[PDB]
Design a protein around this ligand. Structure first.
Ligand code: 8H4
Length: 115
């Protein structure tokens, strides 16, 4: 509270570390459904169903331009990619499996790096 400061974690390396994690996701072989925005003109249903589209290239642009206030907002956008994937794809599909794989991959990197 006012004038009562909690010790806080050193956050000076957060930007660099999120960038490295995002690089590892960008170069994963199962990243292909997530590298660019879904084409809302060509994919039926996506625009109406998925209220907040997100993809790795958009996360990279936001990270590179100071649009994440902290590392938690970065993780929220990453998880949004995989939550959108589950909403729109059957678990059994190639894209559905890719999303579950990438989520697992991310969360381990996240835990190992920050927790
Ligand atoms: N053609 C095609 C098939 C499955 C898809 N999931 N998301 C986009 C998309 C496009």
């Amino acid at each position: 509270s006012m004038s009562v400061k909690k010790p806080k974690r050193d956050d000076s390396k957060d930007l660099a570390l999120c960038s490295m994690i995002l690089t590892e996701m960008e170069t994963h072989e199962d990243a292909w459904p997530f590298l660019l925005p879904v084409n809302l003109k060509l994919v039926p249903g996506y625009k109406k169903v998925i209220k907040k589209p997100m993809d790795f290239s958009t996360i990279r642009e936001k990270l590179s331009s100071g649009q994440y206030p902290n590392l938690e907002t970065f993780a929220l956008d990453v998880r949004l990619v995989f939550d959108n994937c589950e909403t729109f794809n059957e678990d059994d599909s190639d894209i559905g499996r890719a999303g579950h794989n990438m989520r697992k991959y991310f969360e381990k990197k996240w835990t190992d790096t920050f927790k």
